[PDB]
Amino acid sequence: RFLKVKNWETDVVLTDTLHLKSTLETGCTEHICMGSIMLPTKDQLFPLAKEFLDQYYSSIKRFGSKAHMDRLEEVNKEIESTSTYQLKDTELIYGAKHAWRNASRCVGRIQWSKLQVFDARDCTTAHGMFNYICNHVKYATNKGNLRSAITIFPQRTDGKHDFRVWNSQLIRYAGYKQPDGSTLGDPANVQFTEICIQQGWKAPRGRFDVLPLLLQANGNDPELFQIPPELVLEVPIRHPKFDWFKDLGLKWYGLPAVSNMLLEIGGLEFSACPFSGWYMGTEIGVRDYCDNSRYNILEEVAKKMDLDMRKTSSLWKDQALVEINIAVLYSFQSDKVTIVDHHSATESFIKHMENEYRCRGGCPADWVWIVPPMSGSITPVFHQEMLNYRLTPSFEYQPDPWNTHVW
Amino acid sequence: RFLKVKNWETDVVLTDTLHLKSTLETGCTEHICMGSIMLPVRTKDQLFPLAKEFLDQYYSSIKRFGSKAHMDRLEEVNKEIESTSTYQLKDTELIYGAKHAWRNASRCVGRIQWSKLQVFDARDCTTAHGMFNYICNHVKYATNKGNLRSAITIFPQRTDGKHDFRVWNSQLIRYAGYKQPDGSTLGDPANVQFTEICIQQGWKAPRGRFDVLPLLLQANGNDPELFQIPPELVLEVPIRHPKFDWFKDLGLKWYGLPAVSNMLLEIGGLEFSACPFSGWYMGTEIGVRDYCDNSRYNILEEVAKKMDLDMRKTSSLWKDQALVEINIAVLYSFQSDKVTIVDHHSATESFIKHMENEYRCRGGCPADWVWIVPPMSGSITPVFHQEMLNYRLTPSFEYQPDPWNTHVWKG
Ligand code: HEM
Ligand code: HEM
Ligand SMILES: Nc1ccc2ccc(CNCCc3cccc(F)c3)cc2n1
Ligand SMILES: Nc1ccc2ccc(CNCCc3cccc(F)c3)cc2n1
Ligand SMILES: C[C@H](O)[C@H](O)[C@H]1CNc2nc(N)[nH]c(=O)c2N1
Ligand SMILES: C[C@H](O)[C@H](O)[C@H]1CNc2nc(N)[nH]c(=O)c2N1
Ligand SMILES: [Zn+2]
């Protein structure tokens, strides 16, 4: 019931109690671990509201005060009367920060209390959503000095009036299947790109076309908008030693802004809650650039480096991988766009875990996601035991809107 | 019930039914995943079902399930249990059990090889000198002058838990570690405690950076005894780099034979507390973990110094750069000296083919992603992208407490 995690590099042992608060389920049982699987009414709502308000009033050292009891009463009356309820601004801010705090898959959570929350609950139309989103983009981008932010659209009601951003990130590149056989642009986004085209976007059909936003207000049919190009900060990718690197024609965008997740606070569901922080270098250089199913550029880079691609045991992939990642970091830094390397980010996270154990009694963490996709055991998180469990408020996955939406 | 796993690179979906045969527990619950936790005297009562289930599996594998030989064997084991309180495995069943413990080892990336395992039956062994002789023969056989062959040597099973056979060493071949008065370590920091035990037992330590430890061998619950493996049996590879000529001057070498000796083999409820086994190295075990872990030889700084990388900011990726060079060096050295080694690309690719084969023919392959994914270049290996289900099948290899924590000293 009280659980120990050990760091095997430093022998530091932490004791977890926070897991006993855990409410939602993991996918695992006593008979089978699913640790590596990517995706494992009135009656229901009041317990969820109560649990949330309890922790909120606890956090401001007013647990069991008249202000606490009154609010519980007030929300209870509102649920009974209206079958839903509204969060005070203070509760919404607390809820959003805590959803990030509780994100077991996020290595950047040392930052969790510095999150700018944009309340867009008064939004009613897709043009309105576009306006809020451009404002988020500009605020978060901050000319390269990136700031963490979330923009929160109205909560689900009867679920036939959902707000959704159809995009997976606010800023992403299109992907096109070619008449010849290959893929141009980002292969991850072929189906979304097609939806845009079918809805009427005219694609310039290049390798790096910033997708248009596809915005759905109030359960309505989604609409297209182009983010003003001037709000999209992009970085040309060069290498501090290899002059030929620039000729590869690689660029990436500065702002990682995830827009397809669902924020759950006190039982309320925010189906449109685009949020943004800043990149860890490996996301672009290892995953975006080198996944065989992504831009998949390892082959081309190795050639330019004139490496022995005959045998896997020359480690040519590994050599080229490192160079690509040096170049990503160098390019962002040269252009003064916030980026974090995997050594710095994981070291920060170890510190954050220690803070959380010390101040909160634990920190849910998913080792499979937290350890970087390159150089795992030379980062301290590799050697850190982690306990994974589900706390609310939370960010959750939801099915892509096009499989759900009734036109 | 059917469970699906997806590969997110290929979209290949596999269906697992084998998990239904799993009895032992994982550590996980519906409320907590313990997937990254490193480590998460039987009565007659508990013994007969364990024996029965095992013999049922054995007889099925030989297509003799429910045969007269199957039934007579169950009856003979049952009578032997309630009379003698334990039972002896036939040679065929021992071989089958040792292979399956390997097949079932969810943290093992090299399991494509599981059916090629040389089993040495050392159950007639009685003394530590006897153990030493078995172990030397194992080493010489497995080494095969660089053309490594997988093998296991199986000493007598646990009886009352007071007469255990144990190899105190964690691997048959491993380098000594010496904690210095100034707090620095000479040799391998992983083996300081064990090195101290050996010294106390009377080993004369050469005190260098790569001293092969003596064997500390326990037979029949007696105090363990020290023995030196003949040096001519210990194959070693000096480490050099194909392009960097100063690399040799780092003074590095490693041994060819990885031979884990501190695990417990469980077959049909029987416990084999001394069952040293050996395969061959995946290059990252030495080049990533043994050489570059901060708590091990920790050579990253000196290597990057010599490469003259920019070391003032971690964002130069000097560590990642030095890591790749060291790992190229390890593979190059082993290949050049004709000692078996596998790189992490080849090994993970083979594992994926093994796993798909196992799903088709066996209905599953239990696998621990946390261990299967290599400790460098994780996502450019196919296993990173592969969903895996971790569950526990028997026969199995299990951890056991270090023997110095539990041994009752005779004196
Ligand atoms: C401030 C800089 C931040 C850094 C460096 C960072 C780092 C990361 C990284 C590297 C991932 C893994 C994503 C992947 O591999 O696809 C991740 C996951 C995640 N982070 Fe962050 N994070 C940051 C800010 C944020 C913010 C502001 C939020 C929300 C308010 C957040 C919530 C999440 C969530 C929910 C996941 C899991 C996503 C999923 O399951 O697909 N993070 N974080
Ligand atoms: C034949 C070549 C083999 C290769 C390349 C190989 C590869 C590996 C590697 C790289 C590990 C992880 C080691 C670590 O990080 O500590 C491992 C784990 C393991 N392998 Fe193998 N393996 C081989 C043969 C064997 C053999 C012969 C056995 C036993 C008969 C075996 C049973 C295991 C077990 C039980 C583990 C888990 C160890 C633990 O939990 O500490 N493997 N394998
Ligand atoms: N730098 C950051 C910060 C927060 C992030 C939050 C989310 C993400 C992207 N996560 C998507 C992972 C994913 C990919 C493909 C399928 C899937 F189910 C899930 C990236 C982030 N990067
Ligand atoms: N090449 C091989 C083959 C089989 C192996 C079997 C076991 C191992 C070593 N595993 C050590 C695991 C370990 C290290 C430190 C603490 C701990 F609890 C467990 C290495 C192997 N290498
Ligand atoms: C199958 C496996 O769970 C999958 O490839 C995971 C592994 N770890 C990951 N870790 C992070 N941060 N991001 C990912 O997309 C993944 N993918
Ligand atoms: C805490 C964590 O579980 C631990 O460091 C593990 C991670 N994965 C590993 N994987 C392998 N193959 N070997 C190891 O020693 C480890 N160590
Ligand atoms: Zn689990």
Side-chain angles (χ1 to χ4, degrees):
Chain A
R1 164 151 208 163
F2 285 34
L3 289 166
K4 287 167 180 31
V5 292
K6 178 173 163 174
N7 184 301
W8 286 82
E9 190 201 324
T10 66
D11 283 318
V12 167
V13 185
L14 303 169
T15 311
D16 186 291
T17 48
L18 178 68
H19 76 277
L20 299 167
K21 292 330 288 248
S22 163
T23 180
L24 296 157
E25 284 167 350
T26 66
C28 301
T29 72
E30 300 97 71
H31 299 289
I32 181 147
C33 178
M34 307 216 120
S36 79
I37 310 307
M38 289 233 70
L39 330 155
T41 42
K42 295 186 165 189
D43 260 33
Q44 324 173 121
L45 189 62
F46 184 61
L48 297 167
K50 182 168 182 302
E51 183 222 320
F52 173 69
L53 295 165
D54 286 9
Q55 72 183 78
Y56 172 76
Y57 277 89
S58 215
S59 75
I60 65 182
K61 295 125 309 229
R62 258 152 169 74
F63 188 93
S65 62
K66 188 140 173 318
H68 183 202
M69 298 305 96
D70 287 341
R71 167 101 272 233
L72 230 45
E73 160 81 308
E74 169 177 65
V75 161
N76 187 267
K77 285 197 164 152
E78 187 178 336
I79 287 163
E80 260 288 289
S81 151
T82 73
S83 67
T84 181
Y85 73 107
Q86 297 304 317
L87 296 167
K88 305 287 176 213
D89 296 355
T90 56
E91 301 166 352
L92 177 81
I93 297 166
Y94 173 87
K97 279 172 184 188
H98 275 75
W100 180 12
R101 201 187 185 167
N102 295 342
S104 76
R105 284 174 169 179
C106 172
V107 71
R109 277 177 279 168
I110 186 145
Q111 287 291 310
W112 74 270
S113 65
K114 306 170 289 270
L115 177 66
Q116 171 66 212
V117 179
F118 292 117
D119 186 350
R121 290 171 296 162
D122 68 0
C123 191
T124 67
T125 61
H127 271 94
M129 294 180 70
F130 173 70
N131 189 39
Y132 271 108
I133 283 159
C134 297
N135 288 351
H136 176 131
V137 169
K138 180 173 207 175
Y139 175 86
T141 296
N142 190 30
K143 306 167 178 291
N145 183 200
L146 304 204
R147 302 172 286 196
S148 292
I150 182 164
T151 293
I152 304 178
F153 294 99
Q155 70 207 38
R156 173 167 297 128
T157 50
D158 60 37
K160 276 191 176 173
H161 289 66
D162 277 9
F163 290 69
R164 301 283 322 253
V165 172
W166 286 37
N167 314 58
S168 49
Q169 293 181 29
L170 300 178
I171 297 158
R172 254 186 149 195
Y173 297 129
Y176 316 88
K177 270 159 197 303
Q178 294 274 22
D180 83 79
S182 63
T183 298
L184 179 71
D186 195 338
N189 296 325
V190 169
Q191 193 195 20
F192 181 77
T193 303
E194 272 174 312
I195 295 185
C196 293
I197 293 169
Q198 156 181 233
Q199 278 300 131
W201 186 58
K202 115 169 79 198
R205 297 199 76 92
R207 199 187 179 193
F208 287 122
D209 310 337
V210 175
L211 287 163
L213 292 167
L214 230 196
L215 298 184
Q216 165 194 334
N218 200 229
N220 287 322
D221 287 343
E223 316 185 18
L224 292 149
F225 303 88
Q226 185 190 35
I227 304 185
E230 70 270 28
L231 300 192
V232 184
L233 173 56
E234 290 177 298
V235 179
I237 308 300
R238 60 279 199 194
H239 193 279
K241 297 189 306 136
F242 303 148
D243 233 5
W244 53 258
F245 206 96
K246 69 179 95 308
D247 303 337
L248 293 161
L250 312 163
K251 64 170 136 178
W252 209 253
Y253 51 89
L255 189 77
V258 172
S259 55
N260 64 178
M261 289 189 89
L262 183 152
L263 166 64
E264 186 195 310
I265 302 164
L268 305 175
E269 309 201 286
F270 298 89
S271 40
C273 61
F275 63 79
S276 58
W278 51 79
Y279 268 120
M280 180 167 69
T282 55
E283 293 180 79
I284 309 161
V286 185
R287 302 305 307 286
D288 295 327
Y289 280 175
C290 299
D291 279 3
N292 189 262
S293 73
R294 293 298 295 296
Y295 281 79
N296 181 224
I297 64 165
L298 268 181
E299 284 227 12
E300 310 93 283
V301 176
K303 278 158 140 67
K304 276 279 189 83
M305 292 174 71
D306 204 31
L307 300 170
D308 189 26
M309 294 175 65
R310 272 182 273 188
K311 316 166 290 70
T312 65
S313 63
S314 75
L315 309 193
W316 64 269
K317 280 182 173 170
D318 306 73
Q319 289 205 283
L321 180 68
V322 179
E323 296 307 335
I324 294 159
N325 282 271
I326 291 176
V328 168
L329 290 163
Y330 176 79
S331 295
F332 273 62
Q333 295 175 173
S334 292
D335 286 354
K336 232 74 46 73
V337 181
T338 314
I339 189 149
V340 66
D341 72 76
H342 52 287
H343 298 288
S344 187
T346 53
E347 183 212 342
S348 286
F349 184 78
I350 289 305
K351 200 182 180 215
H352 171 62
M353 260 188 80
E354 299 169 12
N355 290 328
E356 297 290 75
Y357 272 85
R358 198 172 37 71
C359 297
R360 203 187 186 199
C363 177
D366 180 346
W367 190 101
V368 169
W369 283 62
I370 298 285
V371 176
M374 72 181 282
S375 303
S377 69
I378 64 159
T379 68
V381 291
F382 184 91
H383 306 274
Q384 180 66 60
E385 300 191 334
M386 296 169 194
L387 285 171
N388 194 204
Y389 48 94
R390 308 243 306 177
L391 300 174
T392 194
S394 60
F395 291 110
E396 294 298 335
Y397 298 107
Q398 59 186 339
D400 285 327
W402 53 86
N403 307 317
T404 314
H405 189 59
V406 267
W407 290 87
Chain B
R1 201 199 311 98
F2 304 92
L3 284 171
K4 312 216 173 154
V5 298
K6 173 186 186 164
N7 188 295
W8 290 81
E9 200 158 54
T10 60
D11 277 0
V12 173
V13 180
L14 306 175
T15 297
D16 187 294
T17 46
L18 189 61
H19 70 275
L20 300 171
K21 301 298 192 201
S22 156
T23 47
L24 303 176
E25 283 179 347
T26 57
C28 300
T29 75
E30 311 76 71
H31 291 104
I32 205 144
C33 176
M34 310 254 295
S36 73
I37 305 308
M38 189 104 65
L39 319 167
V41 76
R42 254 184 187 109
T43 64
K44 292 171 162 158
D45 172 65
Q46 45 219 203
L47 195 49
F48 193 78
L50 299 176
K52 194 192 197 302
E53 188 213 355
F54 170 74
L55 296 174
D56 287 351
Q57 291 168 237
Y58 174 69
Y59 277 85
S60 295
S61 79
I62 59 165
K63 312 161 183 131
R64 288 310 179 271
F65 181 92
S67 63
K68 191 172 177 299
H70 183 189
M71 300 290 125
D72 290 345
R73 185 54 180 153
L74 290 165
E75 208 195 288
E76 168 191 61
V77 167
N78 173 229
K79 292 177 76 206
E80 188 180 340
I81 289 162
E82 37 84 346
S83 147
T84 77
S85 222
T86 180
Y87 72 104
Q88 296 306 309
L89 292 175
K90 301 296 210 198
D91 294 353
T92 50
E93 295 161 354
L94 187 70
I95 295 159
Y96 169 90
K99 289 170 187 202
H100 281 71
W102 179 15
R103 201 181 180 175
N104 295 337
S106 72
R107 291 173 166 183
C108 181
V109 82
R111 274 178 291 170
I112 192 167
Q113 289 290 328
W114 73 270
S115 65
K116 289 95 181 233
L117 178 65
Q118 186 61 221
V119 175
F120 296 113
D121 189 346
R123 299 170 291 173
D124 64 2
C125 186
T126 64
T127 66
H129 273 89
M131 301 184 58
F132 176 69
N133 196 58
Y134 272 109
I135 287 165
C136 284
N137 293 353
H138 176 139
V139 168
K140 189 173 176 172
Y141 174 91
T143 302
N144 192 25
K145 304 181 172 167
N147 184 196
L148 277 41
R149 299 185 279 198
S150 304
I152 178 166
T153 293
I154 306 167
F155 291 106
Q157 63 209 45
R158 178 164 298 145
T159 51
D160 58 0
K162 298 175 186 185
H163 294 75
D164 288 2
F165 284 73
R166 299 287 302 268
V167 173
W168 289 35
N169 312 58
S170 57
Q171 299 183 24
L172 300 180
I173 303 180
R174 231 185 175 190
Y175 301 120
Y178 305 98
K179 167 77 60 144
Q180 301 279 68
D182 73 6
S184 70
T185 306
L186 175 43
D188 189 341
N191 305 315
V192 170
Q193 200 187 16
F194 177 80
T195 302
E196 260 146 30
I197 291 178
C198 284
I199 288 172
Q200 200 205 143
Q201 296 314 299
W203 187 54
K204 326 292 166 180
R207 308 186 59 86
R209 190 156 71 126
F210 300 103
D211 303 335
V212 173
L213 287 159
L215 296 164
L216 198 34
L217 308 171
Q218 170 183 329
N220 202 237
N222 297 306
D223 297 343
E225 289 168 26
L226 279 169
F227 300 98
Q228 179 195 154
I229 299 160
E232 65 267 39
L233 263 32
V234 187
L235 181 62
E236 288 180 301
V237 183
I239 314 297
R240 60 286 191 183
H241 191 275
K243 290 211 239 312
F244 304 145
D245 196 57
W246 51 260
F247 203 99
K248 65 180 186 294
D249 307 310
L250 298 164
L252 311 165
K253 68 201 198 163
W254 203 255
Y255 48 92
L257 184 76
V260 172
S261 50
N262 64 352
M263 292 188 90
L264 181 151
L265 165 59
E266 181 195 333
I267 303 175
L270 308 176
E271 298 181 307
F272 292 91
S273 55
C275 59
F277 61 80
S278 59
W280 49 82
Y281 268 114
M282 178 164 76
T284 54
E285 299 177 73
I286 313 163
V288 187
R289 305 300 314 283
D290 300 330
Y291 285 162
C292 296
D293 271 6
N294 296 152
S295 292
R296 297 293 305 287
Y297 281 85
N298 183 214
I299 66 172
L300 273 183
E301 283 223 358
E302 190 188 28
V303 170
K305 280 212 212 292
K306 293 285 212 329
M307 281 170 71
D308 194 48
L309 310 168
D310 193 324
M311 285 178 66
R312 278 165 319 192
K313 35 186 149 59
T314 75
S315 59
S316 63
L317 304 191
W318 63 269
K319 288 196 171 165
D320 313 67
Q321 256 175 333
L323 187 63
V324 180
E325 294 312 326
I326 289 150
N327 277 276
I328 287 175
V330 168
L331 292 165
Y332 176 69
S333 288
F334 271 66
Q335 289 160 182
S336 285
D337 280 352
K338 301 187 148 73
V339 179
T340 312
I341 194 158
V342 63
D343 74 76
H344 54 288
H345 301 290
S346 167
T348 53
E349 190 169 338
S350 290
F351 183 74
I352 287 297
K353 295 176 179 226
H354 171 64
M355 197 188 156
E356 295 179 338
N357 192 42
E358 290 282 79
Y359 271 77
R360 300 188 197 96
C361 84
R362 205 188 189 191
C365 180
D368 180 343
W369 192 101
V370 171
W371 283 63
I372 294 301
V373 176
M376 70 180 281
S377 304
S379 82
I380 58 156
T381 73
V383 287
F384 181 96
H385 304 278
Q386 178 67 51
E387 297 182 341
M388 290 175 198
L389 288 178
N390 192 204
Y391 50 88
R392 277 168 35 142
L393 297 173
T394 51
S396 67
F397 293 109
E398 299 299 343
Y399 296 109
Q400 36 180 7
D402 287 325
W404 53 90
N405 290 315
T406 60
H407 186 60
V408 169
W409 284 89
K410 264 87 189 161

